[PDB]
Amino acid sequence: SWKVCPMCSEQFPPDYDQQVFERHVQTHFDQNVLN
Amino acid sequence: SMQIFVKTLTGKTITLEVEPSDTIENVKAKIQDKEGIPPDQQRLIFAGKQLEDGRTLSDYNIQKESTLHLVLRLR
Numbered sequence: 001s002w003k004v005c006p007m008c009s010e011q012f013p014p015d016y017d018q019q020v021f022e023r024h025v026q027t028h029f030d031q032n033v034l035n
Numbered sequence: 036s037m038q039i040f041v042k043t044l045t046g047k048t049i050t051l052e053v054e055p056s057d058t059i060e061n062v063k064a065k066i067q068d069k070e071g072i073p074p075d076q077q078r079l080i081f082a083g084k085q086l087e088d089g090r091t092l093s094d095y096n097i098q099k100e101s102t103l104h105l106v107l108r109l110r
């Protein structure tokens with residue numbers, strides 16, 4: 001269940017919460033660089 | 036004339052049949068046909084770049100068997 005952010009290419013392990021991951025991805029459309 | 040893949044944030048892979056001359060909006064309509072998602076709620080991303088509706092796959096030099104990413108947007 002690894003997840004990849006399509007905007008910054010960070011990878012998120014299987015146990016990383018899906019909804020928090022999705023929120024991360026969406027935040028790039030507010031601010032491209034999040035670190 | 037070529038196959039591309041569209042990966043969702045839940046990990047599902049959608050396969051599509053496209054032509055290089057297809058616009059990004061055309062690709063979104065193919066996604067709606069196959070998966071049901073309204074085009075205006077789709078962002079399509081390739082190699083970190085949001086693809087613009089009025090441009091074509093060829094305008095981004097997206098070649099066969101490439102993987103796009105689909106991210107939903109609120110309207």
Ligand SMILES: [Zn+2]
Nearest residue numbers: 005007008009
């Ligand atoms: Zn990211």
